[PDB]
Symmetry: D2
């Protein structure tokens, strides 16, 4: 009668040390195996409370549980995008070509200016959060957003094409307090094929999470 779909941790698209020297192998493991894994569990934990409520098996503090859901569900959605959003230098890094390159110049004027806006947004996230590029469906335009925690300030219905995680656990062991150096080096592992992939879908008015 009542059914909820559960989440699972996606395997990384590469080896934990594949992004070195930009992101340490130890961070990659902790980030993937501990942090991302925790969001998957948190999402299911909240979903199970909701199912128990829906089955009439228990009451519920809907505000608390839905806050839990949003936080965890987003941590998971964003980390799922983050991993394939990167790749070993070669497949990753460099300048973008294709539609993503076109649209970037169109809305930002140049790749460099796009990097400035995105990198500055990432470096200036207050507390933990992300810097992301989304395709805005309503008026069809690229927009860079700052995200606090994992769920604050997303554009309703918008599709995340590229995300940069600036939660301290995403860089501290390697870069320490120097988030800025992390943000700058990260450009060396960005997978534009992945981003172009998602842009291809969003451009057609599609959701661009899978593939």
């Amino acid at each position: 009668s009542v059914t909820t779909k559960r989440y699972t941790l996606p395997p990384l698209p590469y080896a934990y040390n594949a992004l070195e020297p930009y992101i340490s192998a130890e961070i990659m493991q902790l980030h993937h195996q501990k942090h991302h894994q925790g969001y998957v569990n948190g999402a299911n934990a909240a979903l199970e409370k909701l199912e128990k409520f829906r089955k009439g098996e228990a009451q519920i503090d809907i505000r608390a549980v839905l806050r839990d859901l949003s936080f965890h569900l987003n941590g998971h959605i964003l980390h799922s995008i983050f991993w394939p959003n990167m790749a070993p230098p070669g497949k990753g890094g460099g300048k973008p070509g294709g539609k993503i390159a076109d649209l970037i110049n169109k809305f930002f004027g140049s790749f460099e200016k796009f990097k400035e806006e995105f990198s500055q947004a990432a470096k200036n996230v207050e507390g933990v959060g992300w810097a992301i590029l989304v395709y805005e469906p309503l008026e069809e335009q690229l927009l860079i957003l700052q995200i606090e925690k994992h769920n604050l300030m997303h554009a309703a219905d918008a599709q995340v094409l590229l995300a940069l995680d600036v939660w301290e656990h995403a860089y501290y062991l390697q870069y320490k307090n120097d988030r800025g150096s992390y943000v700058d080096n990260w450009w060396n592992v960005v997978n534009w094929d992945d981003v172009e992939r998602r842009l291809q879908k969003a451009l057609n008015g599609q959701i661009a999470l899978k593939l």
Copy 2:
């Protein structure tokens, strides 16, 4: 070399008095003409700052503007979905039908369990916000979420199918502090024909807009 798409206030699908005595014509007028117009304006003002920045004609407080943009943009998107999510009683109200009646019963067990979860999320919003129903694309399931202000707690990439505004200006003039009764009466105007259309687009792997 740099462009930013602007937003405009969408026309209501009906007269202001269309939802009475569920939502007064005064509230409908203010909410739309004043409040919603404000969000369109705020979003555009933020873009103007970004456009200037991207052109190099000016600097920018990226955190400030991205926080601004996120707020107003969501205010605009959610209200644009909010209006067609309702209709003059007869065309609005009743119960769900179609793929949405099927999914609601699938994930919640019944329409009454759904109405209970959604209504409680709405009534239990802390401060000003919304109670929404979205299609979650990663595990393809329907979820109800609480949104604080206009931009807090959205699920990245998810498609908003049904939105219920619980900001005081959506009900106070009529129901005063009784947000609970505002919530209960609201179901008598829900345009389930609109929600179904949105779910159909969502299921096609499309964005729940422009349809």
Copy 3:
């Protein structure tokens, strides 16, 4: 043994129509009997869950209950300060004198500038919240702060001297969406004797409550 002190709704320092034509009696009535009461209620409810928890008598989602407590407790504290912060025209309105007038000139240049900063802080709160003037103990200076909801952005240890509620239920019935007109008119009922007493307590290194 375990005991928690509970909160109670304090009486207004004047009748429900004492602030007209600046704040209608209906607003004052609702805001006091319904809203403020709701916060007192919320704080005690949260404390009853904590007490049960401390008596080993129950379990607890510490994040959910402490989030509830902080919001409601601040709602109560701020409203408790808000009522005596005003007074029927005569005792309220005009410019400040005594120490507060002095400190205001010292830190803002003049009362006119202060009122500018304060009104703009209040007119620009995003969503519901407050504009508050506090005495910063650490470095001894006046500061105006924006508060979102009742608990977001307060300065640790600081003493609230003057509070202006910009939640819609504090002005909507009369000013509708013109919060600005509301804020401008609010200066006519500001009980500067109250502000002064609180500042003097702060200056004394004391908590600015109870007179």
Copy 4:
């Protein structure tokens, strides 16, 4: 003429290695020199913008700057309390005594229970934040609260007695993702005599700073 009072980084009460093995000297150094210095700097940076606005020397995005001031000011105040809140094993650690130990039993029943409520609040702060024990003046009782970032959820006028920093930079280099071990190991350096004195102030209806 307007003046603002600037903030300065306070020296630690002990050597950087003075709290090992519980908190590494690298953390202490980075935490103090980079992070705390950043908040003081950020607080002052906001004051500079506020100062010229008051001197009619420029315009101001009041929401932007007051949001900035709240975050940085709180970071400075809370860290300023955080440092003396700890002490090298000997002067720090063990259980409380005097008034604080006595009050912890009144409101929590036992030190054991208090430790559970405080530990659970700190381990369960969503994102980055603090767990704090304050003295709530209005009804005169000990309350534990969760703080997100440095400025969300504080209780107006409340005096912070003991603060625990759970921002990842406060532990990640040593404890990695295990916030739980960090929280548990921290008690071993708590300066109960400090919490005692601040409680004395609060009990004296005074502000708990500069002593």
